[PDB]
């Protein structure tokens, strides 16, 4: 199978995590799937898989070696507060990313031309996804998850 060598590692107590460079050796098989790399790593570190997030990879011009960077968080409860909204939909935890631009630009249109009376109403119709909403969803992953 694969052979991973961990390369450059820092210790960030601030965001409570350790950052490391990864060098996957797959001489034979094609680039490793982030997923599979996620676990062969968690095993060498001996840490829950979901508390280890791996991002950015490459693949030297045909040679079976891929470089990448990963993250080790101690509390998935920390990981959930720090990681980016986009990395979460990626583990299928946060979800969708609907097209805000267009409509938001159009509401600006109406609102900029009204008095408070209606404005409030309009606002009660701008494409969802509040941050207040992002949190409640983040929170639910919090309680409902426990293990390792």
């Amino acid at each position: 199978t694969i052979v991973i060598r961990t390369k450059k590692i820092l210790v960030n107590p601030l965001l409570s995590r350790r950052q490391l460079s990864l060098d996957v050796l797959h001489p034979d098989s094609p680039t490793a799937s982030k997923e599979k790399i996620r676990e062969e790593l968690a095993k060498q570190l001996k840490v829950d898989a979901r508390n280890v997030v791996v991002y950015g990879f490459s693949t030297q011009y045909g040679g079976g070696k891929s470089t990448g960077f990963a993250l080790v968080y101690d509390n998935q409860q920390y990981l959930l507060k720090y990681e980016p909204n986009y990395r979460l939909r990626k583990v299928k935890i946060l979800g969708e990313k609907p097209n805000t631009r267009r409509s938001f630009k159009e509401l600006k249109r109406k609102i900029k031309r009204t008095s408070g009376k209606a404005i409030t109403k309009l606002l009660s119709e701008k494409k969802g996804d509040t941050w207040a909403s992002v949190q409640s969803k983040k929170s639910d992953h919090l309680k409902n998850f426990v293990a390792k």
């Binding site: 820092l10 960030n12 601030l14 965001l15 950052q19 720090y82 980016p84």
Partner: peptide
């Protein structure tokens, strides 16, 4: 190098 991306700071 404690931080990284720009938002990293924003947190700290």
């Amino acid at each position: 190098n404690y931080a990284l991306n720009g938002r990293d700071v924003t947190l700290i």
